[PDB]
Design a protein around this motif. Sequence first.
Motif: not given
Length: 197
Positions: A147-153, A155-161
């Motif tokens: 599922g959803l990870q508590p970290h964004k890429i 320098d971006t708003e990109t979520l990690c799933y």
Amino acid sequence: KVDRFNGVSEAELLTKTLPDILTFNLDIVIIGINPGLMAAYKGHHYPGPGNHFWKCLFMSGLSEVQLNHMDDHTLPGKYGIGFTNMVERTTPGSKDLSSKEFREGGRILVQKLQKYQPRIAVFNGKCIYEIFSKEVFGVKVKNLEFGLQPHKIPDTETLCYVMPSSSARCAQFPRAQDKVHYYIKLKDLRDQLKGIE
DNA sequence: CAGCTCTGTACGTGAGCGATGGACAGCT
DNA sequence: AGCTGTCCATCGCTCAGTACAGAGCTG
């Protein structure tokens, strides 16, 4: 001998690569591990029979009809979905890849995500997120979750799933049915981000 | 001892490929 | 009636990451 690739040798497929299907303003980028033999053969993403991706994409409602690997180029325009892999090199399975290859892949991948900046970076395989998390976020948890990870890429708003691999090699989620929950939650997260924006 | 990493191993499902042989039609 | 070869239903075999135990290492 068994002919699985219409007279093309496994040795020839091992030299082939699979092109990325990436554009800007994507909602989702599906990040695979690397090309399997059939993806190298076809030059398209997740062809059958040993892969649940296209079935789960339909069963989850992410596509309104049952699509197949030949429809992969239509996904950015029609569905806001693109494709890449952590590792470029083709192998029969993930177990043939080395640690150095994965870490090289991770560096190239974070650079690609920083370029295209999709709303959600989807790791199609827990194993590649395990490596990416340690390499990019410097984080290694005892119990990594899907599922959803508590970290964004960075320098971006990109979520990690993260999702269990769509490969049917995985015995823990033996059917496409056992993985569809993660695709449904992916659709819910996509619809939610498109609600605020 | 107690955490950690690294390697080896076992695990369910559904599908393509190749082998098998029963059903059957065409011939005499 | 007897023979023969094709079709095709069906079957067995192989194939397409993840969790976890135990060894080895180290604090």
